Scaffold this active site. Structure first.
Site, PDB file in Angstrom:
ATOM      1  N   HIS A  62       0.944  -1.573  -0.174  1.00  0.00           N
ATOM      2  CA  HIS A  62       0.188  -0.069   0.055  1.00  0.00           C
ATOM      3  C   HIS A  62       0.744   1.029  -0.573  1.00  0.00           C
ATOM      4  CE1 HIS A  62       0.690  -1.001   4.552  1.00  0.00           C
ATOM      5  NE2 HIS A  62       0.185   0.847   5.040  1.00  0.00           N
ATOM      6  N   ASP A 200       2.090  -8.093   2.373  1.00  0.00           N
ATOM      7  CA  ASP A 200       2.109  -6.273   2.114  1.00  0.00           C
ATOM      8  C   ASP A 200       3.405  -6.374   1.774  1.00  0.00           C
ATOM      9  OD1 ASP A 200       1.245  -4.029   1.661  1.00  0.00           O
ATOM     10  OD2 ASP A 200      -0.136  -3.547   3.678  1.00  0.00           O
ATOM     11  N   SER A 633       3.943   2.349   8.763  1.00  0.00           N
ATOM     12  CA  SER A 633       4.517   0.992   7.386  1.00  0.00           C
ATOM     13  C   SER A 633       5.014   0.940   6.565  1.00  0.00           C
ATOM     14  CB  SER A 633       2.592   1.632   6.490  1.00  0.00           C
ATOM     15  OG  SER A 633       1.556   1.758   6.898  1.00  0.00           O
TER      16      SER A 633
END
Ligand SMILES: [Zn+2]
Ligand SMILES: [Zn+2]
Ligand SMILES: [Zn+2]
Lengths: 698, 698
Positions: A62, A200, A633
């Protein structure tokens, strides 16, 4: 466990580090330009890390999503199919706004910052302006060498200031992304959830000119050669093992006054959540009618859904742990301890009273200020006000221009003006204007803005509808017309008949007065917050505890161990998921539609040499009691030896009240195991040349 | 693990018993009248066990519910409050129908049973009549000794027969029951569920005359002095430990042919579930508008709703483990192995084919048979048919009367006819008659019953109305009238113009014919079933596996280990629940309304010396991989040394298929820990006299 530690303080917590299982020395991991922490880089909102000596970088999917999308077409849809660059020439530009920031130098400037502040005297507004001028001169000197971008960070309410000089790499290219049903398996359904089965990750490569200096994209660029890069673990990560994360957590509020918590919990969070759900619904409805809206407003609506659900999620968390009573009691303990100190506890008690005074001042206008900021944040008004303000700042010498409006900021402003085209449609923006004006006229009488009342000419639906009709005449909907205003003089703004401009020109004296009031309050804060935070620290120390500063975008380390949690009696989340769990979730429909190669590989148990016998499979994701928040992240998870065992990509739902308190029972980071990266890149969507570059080839 | 083992066969599974952790010899636990298996007794419906040398019996709370209710008033609610008898003179009668059966003697009669059957030659009906006659006279001769009740059990399709002679204790008294919010904590909400937090236990005492012989209630009776009784564990039960259950599972059908199982799943279950839901809706709707209906039909409707949910649950669970495919593949392996042998395999293949053919026969009339059975089981039609059949069987001598209609069956018949008053309202019964006659007139002509068609006189809506109007004139409503017919002779039935008795006279020759058809087929099953099941056992032995007979109400031992289960990747159910888990579920409204002494004791952490440090608390309930089914409520759970560590009271919802299958990954028994019995009796609803009687208090 709890704590976002600055790397400089890791030697003082040698004891806890070693107890948790750290095998490198505290000293070795406190080196912000060393091995391993000098491999960690900032992307501008996400963390990433170098994983080869030829500039290969790993982060979350992402985080790379904008770059993957940027390079996708209807007939080569990289979001869905994945991307692989088998040679470095096949890598595709992540676009002119992509950045890798590598830390070059840190300086403690606390002494000069506090002097620049003291030289301002008793005047709060002048204290703020002294600190602005101090910061601007620092940054300008630090950045006089091309290729670098510098930032000043305040820690612990202004107890400490450090200046970070970063190499600003501007040629960033996509090298690998797994298919979207790996990178985002489970989509929004699994968001904030465990069990988790999401791959991810994605890879970039950083490039510079042949002279070794940063440069914008060019075919003549070559890969950057980092001084430090992470290596994959040779030791299999197991339950209980030490892990640590390094990255750039954005903001926490763990030390806020109890009445500050209360105001957030009782007013800020519900008000914002309500507004964002209102806006979400109008965009959802309109986008069903008009796919141009749906495309252009999707990132926007996702932002809203995030915050709106984070705040419903923190609100819920606050109830579960009785956050309110917990803050009141802790603060009662601190205040009683300070009364028990001398004379020498007084300054901190006065500082406490002052902070409550400042909170009362902000509260008196809080509806006015939020509603006006969000009205003005609609696309045409945001653009007109920002462009008019720049025109005002351009008349001053650059050293006196407001942060955000200096020469060094012009590219980011020009960039924003172009980028707006991707997320603006008039008929939608009019509906948002409308909502906000409807909220405005609902404000109580003493929360109004005279300039806006004059501009409206009334306080009813008719005035609203006239205002929308007036504003529909703006030309600021074209990129071309925004770039004209970007270059324009303030007399041109002030002579314009464009109705968005005339709104900006009408309100701007008001915006500057409200800004000056914010800065006066901030100058008071600058005097009182650090005094109170120091006393908090002394209190904690008197009770045997270490202290860490609230997050503030700079690099931190958090550590702990791999472990599940138990949300209720009779059950447990186990620390790992596995391949077979990915396949149990398969429905053949987005977002649970794994690539065929993945289903086949799991049906056949092609474990590719990566299985951990203790869980009987290749691990997918894992939980740990690390302390992360937005900004983390894409952070590397390292083991006891400083080797890569994962990337951070999410937390459990119970984690999100973390911002205010940290619940050690329940708060967990979710990471993607490094073995799952390797497994996908071996068995599902192969990238043998990258695995070779990272010395993990078969 | 899987298996409902007869005690006689335990020595032959010495290997697996020892491997699971049994420390007693298999020889010791093989003795059904020994230490400890002689302590295990049957209540009818439920298991219990002796726990003192003075006749103290422990079972589940829901096993004792009828007795608790019987001894309750509006003003004194033992359901709510619990019951405690501080001396034995305080214990209160469970009533005249309450029984404890204690095994006295077991005889293998296989040889004589098979001889009786073989004497019938190739006549299938005569084979059935020969077994019936063999049983009736074996039971009469065993029971001629007063005080004893006997049962003949067939095992493995009739490969083995055993006669059980049980002491029939008739003076049973309630000694202790925890409060209902303990015995049934979580009520129907937590049915079939884990985590579980239910104190599902209670105590009786068995009494006999001063001469040692059974007697109905009298104050001159003294406590029964059992030859064997259980002791409480003195080693703390932990995860992984050996456990075994001894109890009386009712029936299983684990060796059903693939096609039998397919017919049940595809037709029998969905068809009964359908009718049951329609009848439920009819009673729900009628009870709104009545309240007599509502009260008298609550239990009936419950029972439909239960079966309905369990059938739907089993169908889903069959799909989840592909039960049908596993059964087809194992059956194929058996038939393959028989086919490879010569002539040697042929008898068993022939018996297989015969069982298929009998399934085809019963399938041909399945609609008619189900409809006719359920029409005739409506209350007035059920009563009339039963009573008239009784009058026919009378007037044969007792030795020839069909079982269910002998002298030893007359108390259960009389029982039934009085109890019916609890659950009959004519306005409602009429609707149920209606439903089933409308089912009936959907039957194809070749599925019709001539005698029913004639009685109906027609085959449309008006025919059904005439019939209901006609039947409404019956007098079998009143308990007193049914009792008249219960003593009337065949000739009174046949003169009567009561329209329900008339229905019964009209249909009875057909009912008898159909009974004879069922017995013919049952006679063919007598010959073919054991031959197939023997080949099944021989195949299994070739694979290194042991075989247990289907449950048939005899005493069985199941064994395995305390362990949780994981229904999905990333999570686990842990083997125990704890005190704090009980309190986390408190809402205080029914059924999550624990007694206050419970909340207070847990909040004080008064663990009463019973805590297991491995879980940080006193254990409440636990899971294990034991194989139980209906009949096993109340069964003692024993440890490796044959000492008592809990009671079985439920299973997880994955156990809902216990008739058909066992899933080793998911099927678990739920037990209440004997430490939680003790804790309740120490800290919450005290019974120091019982704890001292059991040598675990002073
Ligand atoms: Zn260094
Ligand atoms: Zn300023
Ligand atoms: Zn018969």
């Amino acid at each position: 466990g709890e704590g976002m530690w600055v790397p400089q303080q890791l030697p003082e917590i040698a004891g806890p580090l070693k107890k948790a299982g750290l095998k490198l020395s505290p000293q070795q991991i406190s080196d912000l330009t060393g091995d391993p922490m000098g491999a960690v880089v900032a992307l501008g909102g996400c963390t990433a890390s170098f994983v080869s000596p030829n500039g290969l970088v790993v982060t979350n999917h992402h985080c790379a999503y904008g770059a993957i999308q940027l390079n996708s077409t209807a007939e080569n849809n990289l979001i869905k199919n994945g991307f692989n660059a088998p040679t470095t020439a096949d890598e595709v530009s992540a676009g002119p706004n992509a950045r890798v920031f590598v830390l070059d130098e840190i300086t403690d400037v606390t002494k000069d910052a506090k002097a620049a502040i003291a030289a301002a005297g008793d005047d709060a507004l002048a204290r703020t302006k002294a600190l602005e001028a101090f910061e601007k001169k620092l940054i300008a000197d630090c950045e006089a060498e091309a290729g670098f971008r510098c930032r000043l960070y305040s820690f612990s309410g202004g107890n400490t200031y450090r200046l970070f000089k970063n190499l600003e790499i501007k040629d960033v290219r996509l090298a690998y992304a797994p298919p979207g049903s790996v990178g985002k398996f489970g989509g929004d359904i699994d968001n904030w959830m465990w069990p988790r089965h999401t791959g991810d990750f994605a890879f970039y490569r950083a490039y510079v000119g042949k002279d070794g200096k940063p440069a914008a994209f060019s075919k003549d660029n070559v890969p950057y050669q980092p001084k430090h890069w992470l290596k994959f673990a040779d030791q299999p990560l197991g339950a209980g093992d030490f892990v640590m994360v390094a990255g750039y957590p954005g903001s926490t509020n763990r030390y806020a006054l109890a009445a500050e918590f209360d105001n957030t919990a009782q007013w800020t969070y519900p008000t914002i959540a309500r507004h964002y759900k209102n806006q979400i619904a109008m965009v959802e409805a309109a986008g069903k009618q008009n796919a141009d809206i749906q495309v252009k407003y999707a990132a926007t609506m996702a932002g809203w859904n995030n915050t709106s659900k984070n705040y419903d999620g923190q609100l819920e968390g606050f109830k579960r742990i009785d956050a309110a009573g917990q803050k009141l009691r802790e603060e009662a303990a601190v205040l009683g301890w300070l009364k028990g100190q001398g004379a020498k506890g007084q300054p901190a008690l006065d500082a406490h009273a002052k902070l409550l005074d400042l909170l009362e001042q902000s509260k008196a206008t809080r509806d006015r200020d939020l509603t006006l900021a969000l009205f003005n944040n609609t696309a045409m008004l945001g653009s007109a006000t920002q462009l008019y303000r720049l025109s005002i700042e351009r008349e001053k010498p650059n050293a006196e221009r407001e942060s955000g409006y200096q020469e060094r900021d012009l590219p980011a402003i020009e960039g924003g003006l172009k980028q707006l085209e991707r997320r603006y449609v008039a008929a939608m923006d009019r509906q948002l204007q409308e909502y906000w004006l409807n909220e405005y006229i609902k404000l109580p009488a003493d929360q109004r803005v005279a300039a806006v009342d004059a501009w409206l000419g009334g306080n009813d639906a008719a005035a609203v509808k006239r205002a929308l009709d007036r504003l529909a005449g703006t030309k600021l909907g074209s990129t071309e017309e925004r770039l004209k205003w970007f270059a324009a003089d303030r007399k041109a703004f002030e002579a314009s008949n464009d109705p968005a401009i005339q709104y900006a020109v009408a309100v701007m004296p008001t915006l500057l007065k409200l800004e000056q009031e914010r800065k006066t309050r901030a100058g008071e804060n600058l005097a009182a917050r650090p005094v109170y935070l120091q006393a908090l620290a002394d209190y904690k120390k008197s009770q045997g505890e270490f202290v860490y500063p609230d997050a503030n975008l700079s690099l931190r380390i958090t550590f702990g161990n791999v472990m599940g949690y138990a949300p209720k009696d009779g059950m447990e989340y186990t620390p790992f998921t596995t391949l077979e769990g990915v396949v149990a979730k398969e429905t053949g429909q987005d977002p649970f539609d794994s690539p065929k190669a993945l289903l086949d590989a799991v049906a056949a148990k092609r474990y590719g040499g990566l299985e951990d016998k203790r869980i009987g499979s290749v691990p997918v994701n894992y939980l740990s009691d690390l302390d992360i928040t937005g900004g983390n992240s894409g952070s590397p998870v390292l083991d006891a030896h400083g080797k890569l065992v994962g990337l951070a990509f999410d937390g459990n739902w119970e984690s999100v009240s973390s911002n205010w308190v940290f619940d050690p029972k329940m708060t967990r980071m979710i990471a993607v195991d490094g073995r799952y990266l390797r497994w996908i890149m071996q068995e599902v969507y192969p990238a043998p040349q990258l695995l070779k570059e990272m010395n993990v080839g078969k």
